Amino acid sequence: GDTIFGKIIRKEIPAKIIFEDDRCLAFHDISPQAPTHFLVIPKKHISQISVAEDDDESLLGHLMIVGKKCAADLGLNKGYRMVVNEGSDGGQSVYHVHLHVLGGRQMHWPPG
Amino acid sequence: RPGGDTIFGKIIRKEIPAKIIFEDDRCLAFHDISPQAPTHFLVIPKKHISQISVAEDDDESLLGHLMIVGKKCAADLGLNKGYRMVVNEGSDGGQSVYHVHLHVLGGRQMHWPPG
């Protein structure tokens, strides 16, 4: 099943794109929860982290490396929080794997 | 002493006890001593990386392995309704131990925003 993130990858609807390569896309979240809140998503349609394959390991790590590079480029020198939600208890909002990166304010504990 | 002398480096070398879920040559999963959810564990690399902001490009496979191990451990622990994975970076991220660690929290509804 296609999702709104598929439409964003395909450039069918607009998003504020931060970075793109051949295998992922980073863009600002439309409902930001911090002064900086962006997403890094694979172009491959992995619906949720629970179904990711072993062969996806380096791709998933690539999301985090891209995320940390984008965070530095966006000036998040005091830190940030990375989040992956899975399923209903995790609060996953779109069934396309996505890494949230939030910063620009103190993030609190517990993380939801 | 490989892994460093943070508490997580000590845990890797079995010098401080921990409730271990899974261990391989690249990482270790163990329960958090101050759980914020009914199930709350960590996955850490055995290689010492202080924080995600200093991870190297060649660390991609290892960082992805933390997530794959995290999701496998969550399934093994029966977290069939889902869970949240968290990496804290620096002061604004709430990081308190400078050895990279992926939190996995589940067994209750997680809320938004994530802190």
Curated annotation (Swiss-Prot), chain B:
Effect of H101N: In NMAN; the enzyme has no residual activity although the mutant protein is expressed at normal levels; no effect on homodimerization; loss of SUMO-specific isopeptidase activity
Residue positions, PTM Phosphoserine: S34, S61
Outcome reported for the amino acid change (mutating H40R): In NMAN; no mutant protein is detected due to post-translational degradation; no effect on SUMO-specific isopeptidase activity
Record Gene3D superfamilies: HIT-like
Positions where N6-acetyllysine occurs in the chain: K10, K19
CDD domains: PKCI_related
Any one biological process term the GO annotation gives: proteolysis
Localisation: Cytoplasm; Nucleus
EC numbers for this chain: 3.9.1.-, 3.4.22.-
MF terms in GO: adenosine 5'-monophosphoramidase activity; deSUMOylase activity; hydrolase activity; nucleotide binding; protein kinase C binding
Annotated family: Belongs to the HINT family.
Name the record gives this protein: Adenosine 5'-monophosphoramidase HINT1
Source species of the chain: Homo sapiens (Human)
